[PDB]
Design a protein around this ligand. Structure first.
Ligand SMILES: [Mg+2]
Ligand SMILES: [Mg+2]
Ligand SMILES: [Mg+2]
Lengths: 67, 105, 131, 46, 104, 57
RNA sequence: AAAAUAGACUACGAAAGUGGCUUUAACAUAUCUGAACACACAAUAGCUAAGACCCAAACUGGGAUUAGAUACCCCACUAUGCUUAGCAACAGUUAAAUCAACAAAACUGCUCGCCAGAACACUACGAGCCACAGCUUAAAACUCAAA
């Protein structure tokens, strides 16, 4: 899980608010949940990922979240 | 150790982008670094408007500079990036490849 | 004194053909481009060669004393800059206490090795106060 | 093996000699670090 | 005006009983400003009190040794050389002067 | 009840059950024993049970 | 300045405590018990010096209200909230009748500290501050058959 892979990290945020999903929604084991969380924050603060919304270019990727 | 510099440069014409890239890599080598690769991720619209050097940016070029630097270099390089006017945002991280995959089986 | 920055890392010092190598790879494989922990490992390896009879045996009391001594040197170097780091102050004071305990045990068990340790690491053993 | 890998790798490093040429080559190339994951755990290359 | 008795305080210079409370009383009021003149009779025990008060926070010490801390001066208009040490003004005079032993 | 393991050791009957009365030559007994190690078990027991009797006599 | 989501996580730290990102240092110890008196921390009161003052706010003023108004609403502004510097443990057991009750199922071993009626009772002979009239500061006797 890399902070530059914004496509993968956008598969774990809310399309309308940009909030990160929890493990009850994502289904990840807690360690990979922590990796995804830290990567998302790193990307957001380093100017790679939007924070208040999901980047529209990635709205049509496979839905891996149970929401 | 091994570091990665993620660089967000100002949306400029090719000669000036080349000049800025040469300048930053020259600074890296001046502070004792061995630059390994330089990769261009592309020119793209910023996720959000970024204010730097009294100018508002909505577009920027993304570059990656892989290098090996002595540990004391990092801080100095950060200061230099704070002074270069063509850089919206530079961040130095420990290279992801050094962090070896944990054995989660 | 610290090891020279040009010294190779402990793990890249016995690899065959390391002397037939380009200068750039030597720099990549030196203490110049590693964090402080490799320099401390090199210090420990040097002291183990200089003091103990069997440098490979690491479970001996003398080995533990040398390791704690290099750790204590690291803590003092750290606290020289972060004067208000109370956690590392606690760690330094504790580590000094256990090194004193190990020195007492070594003195009571092996006096020759005790003298060698005290000379090699520049440690002045002092008897505890009575009250 | 690590040392030999570095023997081969150090050849293609950006020195101060081939600086400008590699800078221009980077400006004439684009790399992509984006890939997607499916519910089947398969990497969907862009 | 006429002689006015402000306080009556029992002390014992040998055991230092009441000396510290005396210092506190002297350093707490507006009216105890200025020079102190330690009058008394011969066997009153003046010298012991002078030695006690000399080695205390009451004195503005510049050195530790009691030889230099106290100075000898001739009494004005006479040749009677007597000891003296400099004292502090009481506390109220910083928010908003010499000691003297006289012949017994 | 009486405190400690094996309180019978602290009874004059046990203390006088000792049968070692040293000749007049013996002045000092030093007893070197190891707290751990099976080979010294008896020695440890010697310290626990019979030293009080030897000293009493 | 302080850190929504993750966090339905329960990790790090001796404790208090720590949850924005990056980088640099960095997370003692191969048996246990053992400090009022040693060294580090930590918290809780109360005063003392200076300093900041957006906002809030005991006290203190002002405005409106029944028929002792709203103690309660509104305005203004203090102390203060801020910033410095100071004053039972440890190892093993679940076998037994577990089992005064109530809590929190009972146990052993080993060590330290502490406990032998009400009574951590009451009382100012006095002492300090004060300076004629007030404030602060106590143990013991004594008594009882209770508590
Ligand atoms: Mg202990
Ligand atoms: Mg206000
Ligand atoms: Mg204890």
């Amino acid at each position: 899980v890399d902070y530059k892979n914004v496509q993968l990290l956008s598969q774990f945020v809310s399309p309308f608010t940009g909030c990160i999903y929890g493990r009850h929604i994502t289904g990840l084991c807690g360690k990979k949940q922590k990796e995804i969380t830290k990567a998302i924050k790193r990307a957001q603060i380093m100017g790679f990922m939007p924070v208040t919304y999901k980047d529209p270019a990635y709205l049509k990727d496979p839905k891996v979240c149970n929401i | 150790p091994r570091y990665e510099l993620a660089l967000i440069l100002k949306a400029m014409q090719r000669p000036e982008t080349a000049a800025t890239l040469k300048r930053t890599i020259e600074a890296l080598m001046d502070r004792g670094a061995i630059v390994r690769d330089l990769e261009n991720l592309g020119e793209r619209a910023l996720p959000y408007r970024i204010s730097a050097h009294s100018q508002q940016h909505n577009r920027g070029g993304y570059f990656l500079v892989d290098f090996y630097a002595p540990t004391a270099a990092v801080e100095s390089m950060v200061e230099h990036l704070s002074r270069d006017i063509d850089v919206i945002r530079g961040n130095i991280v420990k290279h992801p490849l050094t962090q070896e995959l944990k054995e989660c089986e | 004194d610290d090891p020279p920055p040009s010294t190779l890392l402990k793990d890249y010092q016995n690899v065959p053909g390391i002397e037939k190598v380009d200068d750039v790879v030597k720099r990549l494989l030196s203490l110049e481009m590693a964090n402080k922990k490799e320099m401390l490992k090199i210090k420990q390896e040097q002291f183990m060669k200089k003091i103990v009879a069997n440098p490979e045996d690491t479970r001996s009391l003398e080995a533990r004393i040398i390791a704690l001594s290099v750790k204590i040197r690291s803590y003092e170097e750290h606290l020289e800059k972060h004067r208000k780091d109370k956690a590392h102050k606690r760690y330094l004071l504790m580590s000094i206490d256990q090194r004193k305990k190990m020195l007492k045990n070594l003195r009571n068990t092996n006096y020759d090795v005790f003298e060698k340790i005290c000379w090699g690491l520049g440690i002045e053993y002092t008897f505890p106060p009575l009250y | 093996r690590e040392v030999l890998q570095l023997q081969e790798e150090v050849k293609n490093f950006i020195t101060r000699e081939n600086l400008e040429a590699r800078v221009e080559a980077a400006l004439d190339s684009r790399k992509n670090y984006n890939w997607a994951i499916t519910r089947e755990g398969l990497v969907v290359r862009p | 005006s006429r002689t006015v008795v402000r306080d009556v305080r029992l002390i014992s210079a040998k055991t230092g009983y009441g000396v510290e409370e005396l210092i506190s009383a002297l350093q707490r009021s507006w009216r105890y400003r200025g020079d102190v003149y330690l009058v008394g009779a011969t066997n009153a025990g003046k010298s012991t009190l002078f030695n006690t008060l000399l080695e205390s926070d009451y004195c503005t010490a510049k050195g530790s040794e009691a030889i230099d801390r106290a100075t000898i001066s001739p009494w004005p208009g006479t040749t009677l050389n007597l000891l003296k040490f400099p004292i502090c003004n009481p506390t109220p005079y910083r928010m908003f002067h010499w000691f003297y032993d006289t012949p017994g | 009840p009486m405190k400690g393991r094996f309180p019978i050791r602290r009874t004059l009957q046990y203390l006088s059950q000792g049968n070692v009365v040293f000749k007049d030559s013996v002045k000092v007994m030093t007893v070197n024993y190891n707290t751990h190690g099976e080979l010294g078990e008896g020695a440890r027991k010697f310290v626990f049970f019979n030293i009080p009797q030897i000293q009493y006599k």
